[PDB]
Every structure is written in structure tokens, then in C-alpha cells.
């Protein structure tokens, strides 16, 4: 049933389409792309309807059941366009034994990536442009009259904006970017009611971010929660630039104060890590770097799995046998090239690495540490502030096939870590 796609333009569909699909099928459609190429996937037809517990289509950011799940679809609803620069996008088509449906029809394009203007990261991520789909926007709740839906929260939208069922600080507008993205800025508006002509706007809000949409981090500014100041009228746009660029997939806007009701229109700004030169995700997340390539110094519990160290995908983390081991005695090793950095994550009370060293090799037997000139010793990299939110740590491009991360300082819970390596082919 399974197929691989590498040609510039292609078609993907359920077996026998336009006929209804055969029962008890489990096929994988994998699209592969060269570095600097983006995968565009567009569905033309989709009928799987009967929890998708019968017939479903899974879209995977990487290898299925290794890389993160983008979405599961089982309706008459065509999935929205996807732009992947992971280099690999996979579909799993699962059919049951009852009521064969019409299936799905889709097409893909491999397009050369064009990095934005310089290497600027203030690109609108697609709220106004529609690049973010309606599917990608959700909310805690919506107003009863149904005239203020999450899908009306697009910046400069002409029909009200998003309003929740109640005005409280527990309500939020959520956007799933589908893939890990750099976030640098947020633009918000209020809304003047089409009916009453009443002006509703958020005066201040908090930012919550997640990589899986389960573990959340409130974007803190210092040691306390950052409270962004928003709009003072229902029409004018207010842009808040993040003082420290964020790496995330799920964005939540939680209003804290408002004028006469919560109304929100929104734009998100950022870019992809891959927009920067020689910054491809080398396969820890996607599963392109298989289990056989992941090793660690130690490992809490016998017969550990190597797919627990994967950045984002892993719903746990890497743990050393010793909870509290001495610095420089524990390490995670990846066998892969030019390496220009890593992305470090904590583990899902809570464990994350606060300072770390990096060592690299071509041999696997002779190792070097990235050296800070000032120290005359291996450079000491800033780690994470939080167990979920990843931190990208770039360094001077170094050629290697083996990379090790040595935890130096960590949270009171101890060493917990998930990891990706960044770089490109020679």
C-alpha cells in the first residue's frame, strides 16, 4: 500500500480513487525533499466519515509514530494546505472493514525555499493572509450568539472578532502553527460590533506556549509572568515585540484586562529555524536520525528506549541512571556534516538542563569541545528556563558526524533532556 514521493510535482490518493477504498488497509505515503526545498500538500477531495476510531488519515511531521503528529482527519472536511520545511512529511491511511468511503485526493509540490529579505524573523505567520487555516484557530469558548468565532480573530478581519462565552482571564484564543516555529512578535486589535457598534478590546494579556499543546509555559518576563499591554481602542493595531525570540508550535493569548468585553483580532510574527543558513533539523524530531544512532552515558532503568531523547516528539525525555550525577559525567550522543547548533528541551516535579557543554567528532574516538576563547576551556551554553519550551543554541559551523551534550547545571528535579541537532550537508 505504501509509497515514497521525490518528484517535483505529484499526486497522492486512497487506493483505487475515484472508487471507494478497500477495507483493512494500513498504508504510509512519505514525501521526501532536498534541503532548502519546502513541501506543499493540498487536498482536493476527502470523505472518510462514518474520535476517529474507524477510518482515519494521520499526517506526520517526519516518520510516522516517531515524529510529532500534525493532525488526524476522518470527515467530509478537506485538510488545509501544509507548508513543511522538515524535509519529510508522512501520511498514514487506515481503513476498517465497514462502509467503504470515497477516500481522499491530494497533490504535493517541492519548492525551493526563499529566505526572507535578509535573515529577518518578523514575517506575518498567516493570521491575516490565511496561511494559518481556520482549523489551526480555536478558543476556550465563543460567545453564545455565535457572531464572534475564533475564526474571526484574524488581524484586519471585517466581521467583529473573537469573543469568549464569558469575559474572564481563564479564556484564551489558541493557534496551532502545526510545526515548531520561531515566534518574535504579536499584533492585536479589538472589534467594533457589526450589530451594536460597541467597541470591545483587550487592554492587557499573557502569552502561553506549547510544543505538544499539553504542557504549557506562561511567557514570563524576569521571575514573574509577562503582562503584555494591548490596545486602547477597538480599531488601531498594537504590536508587542518579544524581547527574547521564542520557539514553539502552540500559541495561546490569555486576556487579563479588557474594555467592556473580550474581543480579539490577532497576527503572529516569526520565521522558521530553517530560514537561517545551515540550520536544518538533522532528524531527532522527525525520526530521520533513528534509534540506533542515539546513545547516552547512563540511563535510568535497564533497557531504555533511544527514542525518548527526541526533541518535541518524545513525551518523556532522557534520564541518567543517577538522578543527581556530577557535571561532565553524563552525556547524550547523536550519530548523524556541518553542525551549527542544537535545540535543547527539558523532560515531561519537573526536570530541565540550565547549563551545558557540547563536544563533537568525525571519528567517534577523537573528540573536541566547542571552546570559548575567553575561558580557554569548553564554552558553557545557557540551557532552558522551563521543561517544555525549547531553546536553540547556535555556534560556529563545525564539521562532525558525532555530537554529545554534557549537562553542567540543571533544575532541582535533576537532569532531564530532549534534543535536536542543527546543520547541513557539506
Amino acid at each position, epitope marked *: 500500500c505504501s509509497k515514497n514521493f521525490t518528484s517535483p510535482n505529484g499526486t497522492i490518493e486512497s487506493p483505487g480513487f475515484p472508487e471507494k477504498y478497500p477495507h483493512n488497509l494500513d498504508c504510509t505515503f512519505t514525501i521526501l525533499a532536498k534541503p532548502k526545498m519546502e513541501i506543499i500538500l493540498q487536498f482536493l477531495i476527502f470523505d472518510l466519515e462514518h474520535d476517529c476510531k474507524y477510518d482515519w488519515l494521520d499526517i506526520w511531521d517526519g516518520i510516522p509514530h516517531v515524529g510529532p503528529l500534525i493532525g488526524k482527519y476522518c470527515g467530509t472536511k478537506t485538510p488545509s494546505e501544509l507548508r513543511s520545511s522538515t524535509g519529510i512529511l508522512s501520511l498514514t491511511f487506515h481503513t476498517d472493514m465497514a462502509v467503504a468511503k470515497d477516500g481522499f485526493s491530494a497533490r504535493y509540490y517541492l519548492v525551493h525555499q526563499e529566505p526572507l529579505e535578509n535573515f529577518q524573523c518578523n514575517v506575518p505567520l498567516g493570521m491575516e493572509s490565511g496561511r494559518i487555516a481556520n482549523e489551526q484557530i480555536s478558543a476556550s469558548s465563543t*460567545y*453564545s*450568539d455565535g*457572531r*464572534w468565532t475564533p475564526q474571526q480573530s484574524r488581524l484586519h478581519g471585517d466581521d467583529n472578532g473573537w*469573543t469568549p462565552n*464569558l*469575559d474572564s482571564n481563564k479564556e484564551y484564543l489558541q493557534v496551532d502553527l502545526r510545526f515548531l516555529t520561531m515566534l518574535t512578535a504579536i499584533a492585536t486589535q479589538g472589534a467594533i*460590533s*457589526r*450589530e*451594536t*457598534q*460597541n*467597541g*470591545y478590546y483587550v487592554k492587557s494579556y499573557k502569552l502561553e506556549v506549547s510544543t505538544n499543546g499539553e504542557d504549557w509555559m506562561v511567557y514570563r518576563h524576569g521571575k514573574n509572568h509577562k503582562v503584555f499591554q494591548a490596545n486602547n*481602542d477597538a480599531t488601531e493595531v498594537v504590536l508587542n515585540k518579544l524581547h527574547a525570540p521564542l520557539l514553539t508550535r502552540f500559541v495561546r493569548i490569555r486576556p487579563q484586562t479588557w*474594555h*467592556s*468585553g473580550i474581543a480579539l483580532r490577532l497576527e503572529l510574527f516569526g520565521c522558521r529555524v530553517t530560514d537561517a543558513p545551515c540550520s536544518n533539523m538533522l532528524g531527532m524530531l522527525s525520526g530521520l536520525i533513528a534509534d540506533s544512532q542515539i546513545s547516552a552515558s547512563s540511563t535510568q532503568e535497564y533497557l531504555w528506549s533511544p527514542s525518548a531523547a527526541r526533541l518535541v516528539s518524545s513525551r518523556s525525555g532522557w534520564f541518567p541512571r543517577i538522578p543527581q550525577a556530577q557535571p561532565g559525567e553524563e552525556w547524550l550522543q547523536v550519530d548523524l556534516k556541518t553542525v551549527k547548533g542544537v535545540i535543547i528541551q527539558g523532560a515531561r516535579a519537573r526536570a530541565f538542563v540550565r547549563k551545558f557543554k557540547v563536544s563533537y567528532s568525525l571519528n567517534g574516538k577523537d573528540w573536541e569541545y566547542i571552546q570559548d576563547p575567553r575561558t580557554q576551556q569548553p564554552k558553557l551554553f545557557e540551557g532552558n528556563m522551563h521543561y517544555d519550551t525549547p531553546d536553540i543554541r547556535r555556534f560556529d559551523p563545525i564539521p562532525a558526524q558525532y555530537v554529545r551534550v554534557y549537562p553542567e547545571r540543571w533544575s532541582p528535579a535533576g537532569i532531564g533532556m530532549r534534543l535536536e541537532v542543527l546543520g547541513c550537508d557539506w
Partner: antibody, heavy 121, light 109 residues
Framework: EVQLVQSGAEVKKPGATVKISCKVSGFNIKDYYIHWVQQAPGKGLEWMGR????????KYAPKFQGRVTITADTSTDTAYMELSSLRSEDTAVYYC??????????????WGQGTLVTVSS | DIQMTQSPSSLSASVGDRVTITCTASSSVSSSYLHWYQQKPGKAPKLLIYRTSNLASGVPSRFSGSGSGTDFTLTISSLQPEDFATYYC?????????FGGGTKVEIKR
């Protein structure tokens, strides 16, 4: 319990101006919305206008435009309707009303008792 | 603007009787935006129903309303002497807000 208390009845000569008072109380809170309605003796409810108390963003009916000014004092929870260039037909009961907080549907939940203006010479 | 017309203007109906007042719109009003008010002779209007004539507010059970788009209704299942008043419908689907002419309920006795 939200309660609006209006000014007393007045007689005002034709071509004069009348300001009447709507004292919001009971639940109050900021972001109150005040609307003025005119009931002619004959009958009918006619919407003069509304005011965002926090932001001075009055909306007026085209009929009373030019001739009605709505003001809010945030310090004392009182809203005012000023009717310029009075007419014989302006003799009516003027009501002030407010909707509930979260209602984007703007039903007039609470009303004032009514102020009678008798435009007479 | 969207003009509102309440058809029956005067109703003499006896006590304990089912009465029905129409309200009808020049355009289409969203269900959630039609409201109803009761005005006793010497008093300010009081809210009866606030969404599509569906949602009654701390008020007697006899009062019902229904409708969609153009035609909305207010119904008193057992009319009572207390219920003698003028009844107004209001729309806030598009500003400016508009009221109906009113229906003056009277009682046979």
C-alpha cells in the same frame, strides 16, 4: 441590585436646553453603557442615543443629531442628556436605560423611573 | 435601519386567555437580538424576554416568545389582570436600535 435614578420633571421654554441626570448605582462597575429613550405623551419609544461611560463614544439617532449631547461623569456615576433648541413636540418622558455587562445583544435590562420635560412658554 | 412593526395595536382579551402579539421586521433580525418590554400605565418599561423572544428574565411562566428572521411572537398563555400593559419589541441586530409601535392589551371582564 442595579438601579438608575433620574432627575426631576422640568418645564423649559421653547428654544431652551435641558440636561437630565441618570445616577447609576447598585452594582455599577466601570464600562457601563447608558441609552436615552424618548416616550412622547401620544406613545412610542424612540432611541435618542447611547454613551460608553469609560470612553466618551456617544452614538446618536439621526433625528436628535445636532440637538442631543450625552455626557458621563466617571467620578460620580451619573450620565446626562442635554437637549438643545427644544420643540413643542419635545415634551415627553425621557428614560435612561443600561444593558447587562456581557450582553453584546444590548437588551435594556435596567431602566430609570422617567423624567418629564414640558416645553411650554 | 431595520424598522419594527407590531401588528395588533389593541387587544381586548378576557382573563385566563391565550394572547398572541406579533412583531415583524423590515429586514432579518438575528434570533439572539430581538427583545420584549412591558410598560405598565404610569411606569418605565421592564424587560420580559431578551433573545428571540426565547429567554424570559425573573418573570411569570405564561409569557413565551418565538421567531426567526422577520416574524417574531410574544404569547401569554393565561392572560391576567396584572398583564394589562403596552408591549414593545426591540432589535439590536443593526444600530440604530428600533422599537415597535406597541400592543395595548386590555381585559374583558
Amino acid at each position: 441590585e442595579v438601579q438608575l435614578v433620574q432627575s426631576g420633571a422640568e418645564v423649559k421654554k421653547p428654544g431652551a436646553t435641558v440636561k437630565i441626570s441618570c445616577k447609576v448605582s447598585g452594582f455599577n462597575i466601570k464600562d457601563y453603557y447608558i441609552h436615552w429613550v424618548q416616550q412622547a405623551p401620544g406613545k412610542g419609544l424612540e432611541w435618542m442615543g447611547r454613551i460608553d461611560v469609560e470612553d466618551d463614544e456617544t452614538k446618536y439617532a439621526p433625528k436628535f443629531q445636532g440637538r442631543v449631547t450625552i455626557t458621563a461623569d466617571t467620578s460620580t456615576d451619573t450620565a446626562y442628556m442635554e437637549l438643545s433648541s427644544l420643540r413643542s413636540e419635545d415634551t415627553a418622558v425621557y428614560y435612561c436605560a443600561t444593558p447587562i455587562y456581557g450582553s453584546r445583544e444590548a437588551w435594556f435590562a435596567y431602566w430609570g423611573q422617567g423624567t418629564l420635560v414640558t416645553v411650554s412658554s | 435601519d431595520i424598522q419594527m412593526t407590531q401588528s395588533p395595536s389593541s387587544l381586548s382579551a378576557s382573563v385566563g386567555d391565550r394572547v398572541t402579539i406579533t412583531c415583524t421586521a423590515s429586514s432579518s433580525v438575528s434570533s439572539s437580538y430581538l427583545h420584549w418590554y412591558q410598560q405598565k400605565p404610569g411606569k418605565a418599561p421592564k424587560l420580559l424576554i431578551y433573545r428571540t423572544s426565547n429567554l424570559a428574565s425573573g418573570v411569570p411562566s405564561r409569557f413565551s416568545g418565538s421567531g426567526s428572521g422577520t416574524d417574531f411572537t410574544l404569547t401569554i398563555s393565561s392572560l391576567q389582570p396584572e398583564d394589562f400593559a403596552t408591549y414593545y419589541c426591540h432589535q439590536y441586530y443593526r444600530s440604530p436600535p428600533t422599537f415597535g409601535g406597541g400592543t395595548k392589551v386590555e381585559i374583558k371582564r
